[PDB]
Design a protein around this ligand. Structure first.
Ligand SMILES: [Mg+2]
Ligand SMILES: [Mg+2]
Ligand SMILES: [Mg+2]
Ligand SMILES: [Mg+2]
Ligand SMILES: [Mg+2]
Ligand SMILES: [Mg+2]
Ligand SMILES: [Mg+2]
Ligand SMILES: [Mg+2]
Ligand SMILES: [Mg+2]
Ligand SMILES: [Mg+2]
Lengths: 140, 48, 103, 110, 117, 56
RNA sequence: CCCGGCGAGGGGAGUGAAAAAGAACCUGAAACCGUGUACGUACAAGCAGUGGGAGCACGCUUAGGCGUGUGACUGCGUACC
RNA sequence: GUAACGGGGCUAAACCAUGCACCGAAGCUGCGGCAGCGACGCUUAUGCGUUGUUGGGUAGGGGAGCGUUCUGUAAGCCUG
C-alpha cells in the first residue's frame, strides 16, 4: 500500500491567550478561526476534532470597520413569528459585548458537527485578565 | 490404459464446425436491453 | 537510510519495507534483476544528512529489491448514469510487489 | 430443548401476547408464575399455561425443582390466521384478519 | 419450448441483493429499490473515485502551506523557489510525510528558500 | 386522511416505545401462601387481618 | 407416561434410513414478523449512499498502519420510469 | 425573515493600471491496461514487438456474445 495523512485523534490541547485587547477586529477573526481548525498544523487535518483552545481577552473592545460601529445590525429573528424579528446595532452592544467576535468568528467554521463543537475553544470574556479560571492553570 | 487425465482422446464424428455466416444472426427479438420498445414516438407500424 | 525512490507517481517512505508499484514490464521475474534507482527522486529525507531534492550520485545513487511482482487486483465498479443505460463493465489492475534494499 | 413448551396458535395475534411476555423472561419462574397470575389481561393466555408445561416437562422427565429453572428465553412468532370478511356500509366489504401466533417458551436454565 | 424463468430470475436480482451491502431497510430488503440503491453507490462510484484527487491534494497542499509557514513563507513562494530550484521535481504528497519529519523536511524549505540567484 | 408513504419499521417500533409493565411484586401476603394483592386476600378465603366470612 | 378443561397445543417415549417425513406432512425461496449477539446512535437537519476516516469487536493476520462486522466526525450528492 | 455580495467579514479581502507566484477540470503530461483504424520490425492464414490515431451518445443502424427449456452426439459421461 501507500499512505494517508496521520491525524488519528490527535491531542494538541492548548492555552493560547489571544488578548486582542485592542484594535484587532474583523480580519482578526480569521486567525482565531484558523487557529481553531489547525493552520500551522503540527499533525492536524480539517476533518478531526480539537479546536486548539484559545482565549480572547477583553473582546468588549474593537474599532470595528470604518463605520459599522453605529451602522451595522446583526439580525436574528426569534422564532415565534408575530414578525418580531430582532435587530440590534453595534454601538447598541452594551449588555453583552462578549457575544460579538464570537458571533463573527462563527460561520467561518466548517458548518456542522465538527465546526460546531469547535467554537467553545474561544471563551468570550469582556474585561481583560478576569476569571481567567477558564484555564487559569496554564496559558501562553 | 490410463483412465482420465487424458484431456480427452478423440472428437465425435458429427462435429458440424464453422459456417456461422451460413447462420449467425438468428436475430434477438426486440425486447432486451433495459429500455427498448423502440420505433417512432407513434410506433407507426402496427397499422399496415 | 530511508525510502526515496520514485517511478509511477513517486512514493517512498519505507526503508526495509516493501512497496507495490506499476509493472516494471522491462523485467520483473521472481527474484529481482538489475533494478535501477536514484537519489535523483526529489526526496529530501534520506538519512540524517539532508540531501536536497536531487543532489548528486551519478551512477549508483542507490538501489532496491523485488518482491513477487504479480497478482491482478479488483475495483470493478459499474456505471450507467441516468442517460438511458449502457456500460456495466468491471476493471482489475496489474501491479508489482518489489521490496527494496540498501536505500 | 430442555422442556420446550410451545402453544402454537392461541387465537390472540402476536403483538398482543408479546407484551405479556417481555418483562417476564429470564430468571424468576417462581416470580413469572406470580407476575403472570396477577397481571390482568387475556394476553396471559397459555403463557401461564406453557410455563406450567415448560416446568411440568422439566419435572416429569427431568431433575429440577422450584428453586431452579429461570426461563432462559421466550419469544412469539406469527401464525396462520383466519381470513373472514365484514359487511360494512354501502356495497363495500372489508377483509378481517383473525390473527394468531405460536407462543413457545424454554426453561433450559438451571 | 419451456422457460418458467424462476431459478434464473431469483438468481438475477440476488446478485443485487447480495451487494446490498447493508443499506437502509427497503433499500437492502426489497428488490426494486435495491436496483436504484446504486445511483450514488455504483453509478457515482466508477467516476467518483477518480474525482477524489481534490480531497487529498487540498489536504497535502494544506499540510504544506501549513508547515512551510514556520518562517511565515507563502505556499505560492515555496513551490516557486523549489521549482526554479534544483532538479526538485518531486515535492508533492510528501506534505503529510513532511509532517512525519520536520527536521528532514524543514531543510527542503532552505533549498527552495534560496529563490534568489 | 391517509399516510402518503409507508411508515418504516424503525417507525412502528419507535411508536410502540410505551409498552409499559406492572407487577411491582409488592406485598402479596401477610398470612397465606404468598397470594393476595396489595390489599385484599383471596376472596371467600381472604381477609385483611383475619378470616373474612370464609377462609380455608 | 406427563402439563391441559377427559380441550387445544405441546414435552418425552416409541416406528422409521430419516419425524431436519407427524399428517398444516417431498424440496421449502422472497416479501413480512421475531429471540440472541456485535458495533453505531438521545446539540443533530435533506434520495440515506459514495470518497476520507477515528474508535470498538472477531481472526489477530502466527511478526508489519492486514481480512470481516460496525461505522463517530468529514467532501460530495434532489429516486427509477 | 436578516434577505439586491452565497455567509462571515472586509476601508481594502472594493476600483483603475503593471508585474510575477500559486490554486484550479474527467482539459494536457506522466505510468500501467483494453478495443477499432494505419504504420513500422518479426513473421506469416498469421499472430505478435513498438507505434501515429480514435473510443460522450437519445431515435436509430451495424457487430460480437452470456444464460434458460426442449432434440441429436447419450445405455456416453456425472450420480445414494
Ligand atoms: Mg460546506
Ligand atoms: Mg422498463
Ligand atoms: Mg410526436
Ligand atoms: Mg412510449
Ligand atoms: Mg486533476
Ligand atoms: Mg415440507
Ligand atoms: Mg450524543
Ligand atoms: Mg473507503
Ligand atoms: Mg459509444
Ligand atoms: Mg439506440
Amino acid at each position: 500500500m501507500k499512505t494517508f495523512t496521520a491525524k488519528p485523534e490527535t491531542v494538541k490541547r492548548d492555552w493560547y491567550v489571544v488578548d486582542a485587547t485592542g484594535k484587532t477586529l474583523g480580519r482578526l477573526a480569521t486567525e482565531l478561526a484558523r487557529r481553531l481548525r489547525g493552520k500551522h498544523k503540527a499533525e492536524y487535518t480539517p476533518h478531526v476534532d480539537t479546536g486548539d483552545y484559545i482565549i480572547v481577552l477583553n473582546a468588549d473592545k474593537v474599532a470595528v470597520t470604518g463605520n459599522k460601529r453605529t451602522d451595522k445590525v446583526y439580525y436574528h429573528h426569534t422564532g415565534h413569528i408575530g414578525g418580531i424579528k430582532q435587530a440590534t446595532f453595534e454601538e447598541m452592544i452594551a449588555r453583552r459585548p462578549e457575544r460579538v467576535i464570537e458571533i463573527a468568528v462563527k460561520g467561518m467554521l466548517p458548518k456542522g458537527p465538527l465546526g460546531r463543537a469547535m467554537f467553545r475553544k474561544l471563551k468570550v470574556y469582556a474585561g481583560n485578565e478576569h476569571n481567567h479560571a477558564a484555564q487559569q492553570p496554564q496559558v501562553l | 490404459m490410463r483412465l482420465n487425465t487424458l484431456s480427452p482422446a478423440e472428437g465425435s464424428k458429427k462435429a458440424g464446425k464453422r459456417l456461422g455466416r451460413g447462420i449467425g444472426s438468428g436475430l434477438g427479438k426486440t425486447g432486451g436491453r433495459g429500455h427498448k420498445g423502440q420505433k417512432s414516438r407513434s410506433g407507426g407500424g402496427v397499422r399496415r | 537510510m530511508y525510502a526515496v525512490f520514485q517511478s509511477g507517481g513517486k512514493q517512498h517512505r519505507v526503508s526495509e519495507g516493501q512497496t507495490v508499484r506499476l509493472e516494471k514490464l522491462d523485467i520483473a521475474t521472481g527474484e529481482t534483476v538489475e533494478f535501477a534507482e536514484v537519489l535523483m527522486i526529489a526526496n529530501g529525507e534520506e538519512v540524517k544528512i539532508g540531501v536536497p531534492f536531487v543532489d548528486g550520485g551519478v551512477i549508483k545513487a542507490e538501489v532496491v529489491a523485488h518482491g513477487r511482482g504479480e497478482k491482478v487486483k479488483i475495483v470493478k465498479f459499474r456505471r450507467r448514469k441516468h442517460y438511458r443505460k449502457q456500460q456495466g463493465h468491471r476493471q482489475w489492475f496489474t501491479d508489482v510487489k518489489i521490496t527494496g534494499i540498501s536505500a | 430443548m430442555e422442556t420446550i413448551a410451545k402453544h402454537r396458535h392461541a387465537r390472540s395475534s402476536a403483538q398482543k401476547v408479546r407484551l405479556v411476555a417481555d418483562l417476564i423472561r429470564g430468571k424468576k419462574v417462581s416470580q413469572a408464575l406470580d407476575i403472570l397470575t396477577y397481571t390482568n389481561k387475556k394476553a396471559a393466555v397459555l403463557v401461564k399455561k406453557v410455563l406450567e408445561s415448560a416446568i411440568a416437562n422439566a419435572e416429569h422427565n427431568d431433575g429440577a425443582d422450584i428453586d431452579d429453572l429461570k426461563v432462559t428465553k421466550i419469544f412469539v412468532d406469527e401464525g396462520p390466521s383466519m381470513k373472514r370478511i365484514m359487511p360494512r356500509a354501502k356495497g363495500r366489504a372489508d377483509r378481517i384478519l383473525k390473527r394468531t401466533s405460536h407462543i413457545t417458551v424454554v426453561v433450559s436454565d438451571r | 419450448a419451456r422457460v418458467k424463468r424462476g431459478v434464473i430470475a431469483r438468481a438475477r436480482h440476488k446478485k443485487i441483493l447480495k451487494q446490498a451491502k447493508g443499506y437502509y431497510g427497503a433499500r437492502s430488503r426489497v428488490y426494486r429499490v435495491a436496483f436504484q440503491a446504486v445511483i450514488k453507490a455504483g453509478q457515482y462510484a466508477y467516476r467518483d473515485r477518480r474525482q477524489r484527487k481534490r480531497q487529498f491534494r487540498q489536504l497535502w497542499i494544506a499540510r504544506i502551506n501549513a508547515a512551510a509557514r514556520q518562517n511565515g513563507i507563502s505556499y505560492s513562494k515555496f513551490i516557486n523557489g523549489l521549482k526554479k530550484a534544483s532538479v526538485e521535481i518531486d515535492r508533492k504528497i510528501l506534505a503529510d510525510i513532511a509532517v512525519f519529519d520536520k527536521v528532514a523536511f524543514t531543510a527542503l524549505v532552505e533549498k527552495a528558500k534560496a529563490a534568489l540567484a | 386522511a391517509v399516510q402518503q408513504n409507508k411508515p418504516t419499521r424503525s417507525k412502528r417500533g419507535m411508536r410502540r416505545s410505551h409498552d409499559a409493565l406492572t407487577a411491582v411484586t409488592s406485598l402479596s401476603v401477610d398470612k397465606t401462601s404468598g397470594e393476595k394483592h396489595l390489599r385484599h386476600h383471596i376472596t371467600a378465603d381472604g381477609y385483611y387481618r383475619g378470616r373474612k366470612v370464609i377462609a380455608k
